[PDB]
Symmetry: D2
Subunit: 421 residues, 4 copies
């Protein structure tokens, strides 16, 4: 136990009275609305979202990085920190690894994971930066590079990621690359995309029978004029071209200003290509902020589409849920804790939507009552449900408060050497 059980117990007991009052009051309100609070809590306690290993350490911008104390030394330290998030929120049992950042003996990774009660989600390849000893640089691209030898090198890297994933329990590979151009004319749009498709076809051939291959689109950054996998349209073309094992991953902050993201989610689901999500929030670009910290309603609307899929009886729909955030001005552990909480919050609210009533309002084109039906769910403070879900599963009623009371950050700050070069 990364966090002493007596601390979790003490903090839960300190807040037990208030939780009881709030949960029971909410339960009565929901009952009057025809909703069984117990049914909602039972589903919420089962909702999981993968934590990014790269989000456990402090992030930075192209301008600067301002590390905090106790920054993780490597993947093992990162797993230890992820274990804290899982213990307290009980919503993050799986971790997303990024290669080569987290490269290590697969057996050892698996051993540490099992010891901490953690599993592993989709693997993430990295051909948007150069590792030492590469025969070819990814400066001008990777899977879509004009040089065949460079593309082959990128393909082999992705295959290595699959090998590592197979050994640790992963069942998918997420491919996000920076491939694109910064100047008009620099790249032939079609040829670059064709090169990418050929390279991905090779990676696809290396997928086990029960694995999925996720391609992640992004409008811009690092490329500032054009990006090969720039949007969901191109992403759909990728998934459809590659095969049934290939699907699309939607990262919330990767869309053009004002884009209706929840519709994109609906479209991909309709055509069976919604592989998963990379949750985060943003206001300007790919800000990678704590989920729901900027636009909580949008997060709810995305989950409204996810829950509607279940309501429409979509078969074989098991999208992967993952947090993809960077924490530049907060304790990464605290931000991941509250972000996972916010994701469960939006999910819980989506479960509250009276879809029988909503369907009627949609049929009759009663736009006002239709939107009010979504709002009645969204306006509901489901914090008591999230807190109770944590209580019953060994978590903390107030995760961040318990984390702070444990003195964990100071502890690891004394065990981990800060970077000096």
């Amino acid at each position: 136990f990364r966090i002493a059980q007596d601390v979790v117990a003490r903090e839960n007991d300190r807040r037990a009275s208030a939780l009881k009052e709030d949960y029971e009051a909410l339960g009565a309100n929901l009952a009057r609305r025809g909703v069984d609070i117990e049914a909602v809590t039972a589903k919420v306690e089962k909702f999981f979202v993968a934590v990014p290993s790269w989000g456990v350490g402090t992030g930075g911008t192209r301008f600067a990085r301002f590390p905090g104390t106790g920054e993780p030394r490597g993947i093992f330290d990162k797993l230890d920190d992820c274990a804290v998030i899982q213990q307290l929120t009980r919503a993050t049992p799986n971790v997303s690894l990024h290669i080569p950042w987290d490269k290590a003996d697969p057996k050892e990774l698996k051993a540490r994971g099992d010891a901490l009660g953690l599993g592993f989600d989709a693997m993430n390849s990295n051909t948007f930066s150069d590792a030492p000893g590469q025969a070819h640089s990814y400066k001008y691209g990777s899977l879509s590079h004009t040089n065949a030898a460079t593309r082959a090198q990128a393909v082999e890297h992705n295959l290595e990621c699959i090998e590592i994933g197979k050994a640790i329990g992963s069942k998918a590979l997420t491919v996000w690359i920076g491939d694109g151009s910064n100047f008009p004319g620099q790249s032939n749009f079609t040829r670059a995309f064709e090169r990418y498709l050929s390279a991905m076809a090779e990676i696809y051939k290396g997928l086990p029978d029960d694995w999925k291959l996720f391609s992640e689109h992004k409008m811009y950054e690092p490329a500032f004029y054009s990006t090969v996998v720039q949007d969901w349209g191109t992403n759909y073309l990728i998934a459809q071209t590659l095969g049934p094992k290939a699907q699309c991953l939607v990262d919330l902050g990767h869309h053009a200003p004002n884009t209706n993201i929840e519709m994109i989610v609906a479209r991909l689901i309709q055509f069976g290509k919604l592989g998963g999500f990379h949750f985060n929030d943003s206001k300007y670009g790919d800000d990678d902020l704590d989920a729901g910290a900027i636009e909580p309603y949008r997060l709810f609307l995305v989950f409204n589409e996810l829950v509607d899929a279940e309501a429409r009886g979509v078969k074989g729909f098991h999208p992967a849920h993952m947090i993809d955030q960077k924490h530049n001005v907060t304790d990464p552990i605290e931000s991941l804790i509250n972000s996972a909480n916010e994701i469960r919050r939006a999910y819980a609210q989506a479960l509250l939507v009276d879809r029988a009533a909503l369907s009627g309002y949609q049929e009759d084109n009663d736009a006002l009552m239709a939107t009010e039906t979504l709002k009645r769910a969204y306006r509901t403070d489901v914090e008591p449900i999230l807190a109770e879900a944590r209580r019953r599963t060994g978590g903390a009623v107030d995760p961040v408060a318990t984390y702070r009371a444990s003195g964990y950050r100071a502890r690891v700050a004394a065990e981990r050497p800060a970077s000096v070069a």
Copy 2:
């Protein structure tokens, strides 16, 4: 001839000397660059783009409409005005009709067109507004409306557009609808799209063997929260689902801020679904401004993708080019003239790109020289080519100047009723 031939001749002779000097200088410059100016002019002379019948009348916004003098009374006046654009620019031989706005006897329409030297491009259906005597309102949608009878009415309307088109020589139907929602929850995104696909399938069944069905995406307006055919991704799904006769139409001002539109064009070409274009310019939303008046380089970049495809000869590839603009503060005829000119300008510059050099710089990842290779073409003032193309094909060296010298606007102002200012409405 809408414009007296002696006026066209007089205004051309007045500018012939300067044109000769500019054309010969550009010719020498292009020769030093290994380019034969005659080959470029020959292609420019053959580049055509359709003009919208609804574009020759003054447009407006939801706040007001400020009509000018000599506004067209109906489709016959509109065709007469479009004839001026074609006579002077020689780049707009075909007109795009919108139903029911341009409803009229098909035989009479065909007759006026043939007499004016105009043909007809894609028909445009209208299920984004209610017409008098209409049984079902399109307030909450049309092809994707929840009410079966309303969807059926919309389908029948589109089939009627096909029938009118068949009678006048049209070979395509462009479908743009406002269908969408203004509030979260109002529409079920998936069910609405399913209804749309089913309705379009019925329209597709009524398409002649040599016809095309174009669906046009738009991010927003009139719907302000969600739109059924919101972007090119959804548009691709539509075209792929319907069949080989269904393709996507790209309207420049219908994309999210900062979208790389030229890439969308390339992607659609790659997958054989680029049906055509709706040219215009914009800075904020679907502004429908004169093509190239705001971002001329973007227009060139779009044409760079078109010419690349036209270069490696993607056989059969014949996208339907059309101007889709609204003119709220200028003489519509003058704006359409200069807009058509700007479209030919971008095309001409794209033709100047050294494709071999560009390919070399792309393969070598010489980003700077690759971009400079495009700029060397774009920086070239091709006006002499555009002017000479017009001069030798019956047009005017300086179209707007000749239009003004003819006094055409004052002429039609005296032949048509005066207009009154009003509220919103296109």
Copy 3:
């Protein structure tokens, strides 16, 4: 009483038990948080926002207008419909008039208002469209038009709006114009702005000393290349140049994509030029949608700045609140009702913010707890407070439910055949 009192009473009694349960539950929760629910309800009951006369009728786009049944046929019908919004929500006692759309005998307008329990907020001038008999067209502008006679005509129109307002109790003039250009070069940015400033100075000269002059910025539409009063920066320059009675009006949907609007609010307050607001919501452009229907948190953050101004001790700050929306696919009355409700919702939530705790986290740079402090207020379902506030002041526990139960729309549909 547009809505029968027995209907209001009936529908309130039907929901009285549930409200009592929810209100008491919330009261207990707030007490544990050191907040007295009664103090919040008292303030919510006094928060008012003006309703736009041009918003009670169905709106439309440049593509089409789809009227519903019982459409108001003029300003008098519009006042009758506005009376319904006020009676049920008790949050919209004042109506904003637009001239010449609402031209009618000022004396009669006032008489109708008094009879309906409605007052009048800021007057709105219209030099973005042409009226019959107008000597000069506003096609190429109004207050900033290159033609002196056209500018003078626009100034005179604004002065006429002031005279109408003085007769009905209005104390402010809001000026929003479409002036701008659709093409580079069409206008000389500086000269057009100089003309605008000179014309506005003439309006200011004729502004009563008990009135305020509000200028409203807008990034684009109807002008699609440049707009004279395009943003808050230009707006500030205008207000500062004209004088102390001139201030800036912030319409939520009039900003560039991703703009931090709440910061603009804070800036104008700091420099004493925040005249008021035009509430609405949007996702793409100036969509004019129901307030809070798209981005409810943003609305809360705007109110967080308004409440902080009070907490900071800002003096002489009494911004004019107005709803500026168009309703194209809903019953205008229902939309205005729920929009007024949403505005009070955001206000109530802003009042729940623990200012002392927030200040502490801000000074200590505890970003996570600072943001969580705002969320603790925002996540609170204040509907019971809004409902009780309405019940206590003569309104309805569930406004739209009561509205539908009354059959008012069907009633006016029958009274206003089309």
Copy 4:
């Protein structure tokens, strides 16, 4: 000379015949339009834009940095490379320094600049990153940080930048900070701005009589929710509050999507607060791409406002021009060369605008001819003018071509060891 004169001469001679033909042809075309090409060349040769010391090295993103060969390490190597840009384009005689990146003995810096034929433009302070041994971190801000000692440290740093500038010939200090918040509530907008204004007032007090203080606004990045100096509105409030020595700096890529930037320029000019520019191009955010590589017309429209201000003799008009770009996938020197070229290109085209005709069309509300009047100027290929201006003043007819023929990159690659 960084580039051998015989190479410059040789590469000019091999392109002289074509230039002669193009310049004479453009001269005739302009003559038919009532314009004296020599008059345009005279103005173009006097247009200068400062090159950023931090621009000659290869840039990167938060994801990675892919250095090229012969990367300049330190201000001395950087000045050597900036010297090449000036020698070949003759449009960048001054360099913008950034402290502490370019820290070096002032006397030595000035001596090096003088020897290379380079001057120094506005100094740039850096309180958006932490330097080793720093007592207080700028993680949560600098000039507007909540902690007094931190603000004091930031103020002192800026005063140090002024001292360095005074020693080398600079006459201005540009202040761009990342100060802001990533979460609603994290900062109190007003209090943060008050702190910023008070701190800047202290910096203002340290300005020599003939110095200017430039504040640079930016919508976002590094702050992703709010930024203290977020737009030109706040920037204007800053300048007006601080005093006559304080003006606003407009960086093209620092505005919200679809913003009409040229109007912002016009507004600042009208109120005498246009301190200067940071030229670059962009398509999505603050991309820092080569000027004019994405939207050349927008660049021309900005220059149209600059030339109009001059035409009407606007009082107090004298903006400082600077390039602020990052080069991630090109040779930095080549990009700066062509960027400086694009800036002079837009300027030259703006000079071609028939101001009398334009004024007439504006007064008569002839929108179509007004816009065509701008287009007639913009459509003109002024490359011959730019090239001839360079040829007559010691520069290269085709700068990048001469640069590549010189083998300069390979030369410094041999003199400067790469990481690998």
